Design a protein around this ligand. Structure first.
Ligand SMILES: Nc1ncnc2c1ncn2[C@@H]1O[C@H](COP(=O)(O)O)[C@@H](O)[C@H]1O
Ligand SMILES: Nc1ncnc2c1ncn2[C@@H]1O[C@H](COP(=O)(O)O)[C@@H](O)[C@H]1O
Ligand SMILES: Nc1ncnc2c1ncn2[C@@H]1O[C@H](COP(=O)(O)O)[C@@H](O)[C@H]1O
Ligand SMILES: NC(=O)c1ncn([C@@H]2O[C@H](COP(=O)(O)O)[C@@H](O)[C@H]2O)c1N
Ligand SMILES: NC(=O)c1ncn([C@@H]2O[C@H](COP(=O)(O)O)[C@@H](O)[C@H]2O)c1N
Ligand SMILES: NC(=O)c1ncn([C@@H]2O[C@H](COP(=O)(O)O)[C@@H](O)[C@H]2O)c1N
Ligand SMILES: [Cl-]
Ligand SMILES: [Cl-]
Ligand SMILES: [Cl-]
Ligand code: NA
Ligand code: NA
Ligand code: NA
Lengths: 329, 329, 329
């Protein structure tokens, strides 16, 4: 291949570049010098390592296509990405739509996705809510409970003094993260895998007896540490997949389309509702478990297919059918 | 093959029909029209999809053998299954023995399986118990504690007024679900895999600080959402396997035998006791993780073997050795 | 091969002996007669089974090399192992350094590994601590809190009466167990896999509502039941791997080297710190999940590589390059 596959040296670069190698591409990682050994020695998946944040000129010279990851908004910034001259796998317009809370809400509403109800006025609370002044977060049962806690925790003594808070329907369920891939080449959605994200200290507090917890003011945090593989109850799959289809269709109207990997981040309630908190409109690191395929890909492929490999398969096929320009922005 | 493998379109049908395809069988799914795309498009494992609850005549015409799942008792009912004219993989007599609490208890007792002690009289309580009036469930330390709580939660003011409750030894341990397969063709038990079931809201409450929990009357639910793969400590395997052997042997006496997949559903205590709450005498959906084999099957096979594939292997071999009638009822 | 691979019949023997078979070795398990069927029938990985605790003479006659596991210190004892005449895969000097709390502390300090701060004097407490009189364990905020609890729980009324306790910095994080392998043949460290150990009753208490917990004096236990596969956030890998490198380098100075499998047992904090509680300087049973390779080995191998197989690969290669004596003590 003339085209090389490149990505930032973090997040899911190991999986992405291995998938690229499996499909016959030469690979490029770019990032911190500290992590060069990870990608060239411990897991030798990068044919080139460039010790720079975003080496645009070198990437152009190497005929690179960049695969975006969660490290893109986090480490390079939306404006840098939107202005990049290196071909980008996916639609870079999606970045604003997934990052802006209001645009994301508009997207999910158009896609008919179940999300927590937002309350603009605390006096409209009729079911338990989570108040977001993940730090300082607390629950409120009703308006009366809210105002007592607004006084106790936030020092609010008058209703006109309440400012810059989020009030949201509290939705209790188990975290579930389905990983999708939409092929623009084949015009087809796939379920790639599913994971349960592993977070600290939130996933550690369950090991602490209530009695010991109550002696302290608990400071619950949601730092992402890793990922645990799961499968869903089979009868839940159709609605999870239909949700993915609706998200893609909505994006076709709103932002010029969505293709490649994405994830809907949410919880499953005891009433079997998938309620979505966030959309990640690119590869998520939960896919890293599935370098050797997943319980889902092995239902439909004769070989191991990670999301990383699936990306490289899409690029290769696009090249094979003279439509590479269709999958790049 | 003349014989085709069929199952209801839910529970573990993806795994079952993929396993059938891997072994050279043509496949049939039957169920709700809503889920047809799951089995024909997103994961194309069904050669035929019949949009009916139980299309007996069509299944007979297609020379189907039906593989039972948890969706059978749940969605078709024991009487329908017992009367079905389509050949059934396994012993359909087991359905009553696994579903009737007293027959199940008799089975497990005969099989020398550790189960929670049942208390008929609350005044006989000498160790902590769980009271089942999973809703309304509460613990009691002793008879005095029980009667106070029976008054508080159930309104029982006189001992003669207590009616229709379950009182059971409370057993604290981590949920463990070993998946077995007994080959009637080979007269051999295998351990196929092990999972930890993922349930809502019960597996979500550990993420909630005690302080926040105590502000509400908690309503703990055990809705099944999915499955997480596990392995056991190696020194625990022999007793887990011996338990499986005893279950099979007991069934040979009581109900005309048990063969094919099954699962013992329970917990492991800190004293390394496997205590069983339920038997599922057919494929369990925890096996869905292991489409590409499991940490256990890869110890003894040179290829990926799911429980679904193992079922198809048994059927094929039965056909090969002219003993298909032995594995069907 | 003339050399046969042997191990005690527990812990990770299934994985070890399967890995040995995959690499062309004949295999020996030795242990309890009760477990013979596990290794010869249910998972036929042992060519020879010797029904003895440590059959030295028979093992010498069979040209065995022994692969150590966690069952070695637990079931045979350090003195027996140090005196064994059968060739031992790894450095048997490491056993004291990993088992003696003070030697282990010295090792980890030399290796620049983050560990909980130890407090010799309770009056020096300035951050929350765990007190270890895992039974009887409690937390203390400060010296005043400690002495109140020392009186309440331990009956200590005078400061001079306090004896034989451990006081340690309390570190809240999610359990993480990276599995390493250092090849002496190749002079190279690998990350083999990562798991989250599954423990009872500690991992069951999160399913119990705070209200129900508080009615009882909780007795939290940490009995190991099994293992759950995980991957880490990719940006955390370099420091995890560097920690492994430092451990190996430190051992080269202190104890004549470390090679073969090992594990650093700890937690990841919300501030992305890996804090280590223990080192296990041999194969850990968390590797048992990865009989068919791991999300990490499949990044760098074209075939399934468990830690068990990796051990056999090292032995075979040592033989191939006439340096077997270098990997044995
Ligand atoms: N509406 C909600 N209901 C229940 N849990 C929530 C809600 N919003 C956020 N959370 C939880 O709190 C964490 C931090 O929230 P955020 O800061 O909004 O990402 C999330 O990862 C969720 O687990
Ligand atoms: N005897 C028992 N001891 C401890 N936990 C139990 C017991 N019986 C049931 N449970 C738990 O409560 C849940 C619901 O119980 P059941 O409604 O009997 O299936 C089960 O899935 C178990 O996790
Ligand atoms: N310094 C510490 N901070 C937090 N948790 C700890 C600490 N030391 C031990 N633990 C936990 O308590 C369990 C039993 O401790 P030990 O008896 O020291 O192995 C460990 O497996 C850890 O999960
Ligand atoms: N563990 C699972 O994923 C699971 N999936 C289904 N089941 C059982 O089978 C019954 C039918 O499932 P479904 O309602 O998804 O068709 C359910 O009520 C449940 O008891 C399970 N235990
Ligand atoms: N993680 C595991 O599955 C595990 N299995 C065994 N072990 C360790 O090895 C020792 C011996 O195990 P066994 O008692 O199953 O032979 C145990 O006391 C324990 O410290 C483990 N950590
Ligand atoms: N689930 C994961 O392992 C994960 N890894 C990374 N991320 C997201 O990507 C962002 C960048 O990750 P990193 O800081 O490791 O480069 C993080 O802030 C986080 O939002 C994840 N969700
Ligand atoms: Cl992510
Ligand atoms: Cl089931
Ligand atoms: Cl171990
Ligand atoms: Na988003
Ligand atoms: Na049952
Ligand atoms: Na140690």
């Amino acid at each position: 291949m003339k085209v090389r596959i490149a990505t930032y040296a973090s997040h899911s670069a190991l999986q992405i570049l291995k998938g690229a190698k499996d499909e016959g591409f030469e690979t490029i990682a770019f990032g911190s010098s500290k992590v060069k050994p990870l990608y060239t020695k411990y897991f030798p998946v990068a044919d080139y390592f460039i010790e720079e944040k975003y080496p645009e000129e070198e990437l152009l010279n190497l005929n690179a296509v960049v695969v975006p990851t969660g490290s893109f908004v986090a480490h390079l910034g939306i404006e840098l990405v939107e202005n990049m001259k290196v071909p980008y796998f996916g639609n870079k317009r999606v970045l604003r739509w997934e990052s802006d809370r209001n645009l994301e809400r508009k997207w999910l509403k158009k896609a008919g996705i179940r999300v927590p109800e937002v309350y603009e006025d605390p006096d409209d609370i009729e079911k338990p809510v989570i108040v977001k002044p993940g730090k300082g977060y607390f629950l409120a049962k009703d308006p009366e409970d809210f105002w007592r806690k607004a006084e106790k925790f936030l020092g609010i003594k008058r209703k006109e003094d309440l400012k810059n808070i989020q009030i949201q329907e509290y939705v209790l369920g188990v975290p579930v993260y389905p990983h999708y891939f939409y092929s623009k080449v084949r015009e087809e959605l796939e379920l790639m895998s599913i994971d349960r994200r592993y977070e600290s200290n939130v996933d550690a507090i369950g090991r602490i007896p209530a009695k010991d917890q109550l002696e302290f003011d608990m400071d619950i945090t949601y730092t992402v540490i890793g990922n645990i593989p799961i499968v869903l109850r089979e009868s839940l799959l159709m609605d999870v997949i239909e949700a993915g289809e609706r998200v893609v269709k909505a994006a076709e109207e709103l932002m010029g389309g969505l293709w490649g990997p994405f994830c809907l981040e949410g919880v499953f309630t005891p009433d079997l509702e998938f309620v979505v908190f966030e959309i990640s409109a690119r590869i998520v690191a939960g896919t890293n478990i599935f370098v050797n395929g997943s319980p889902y890909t092995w239902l439909r492929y004769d070989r191991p297919v990670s999301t990383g490999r699936r990306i490289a398969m899409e690029i290769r096929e696009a090249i094979e059918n003279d439509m590479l320009e269709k999958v790049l922005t």
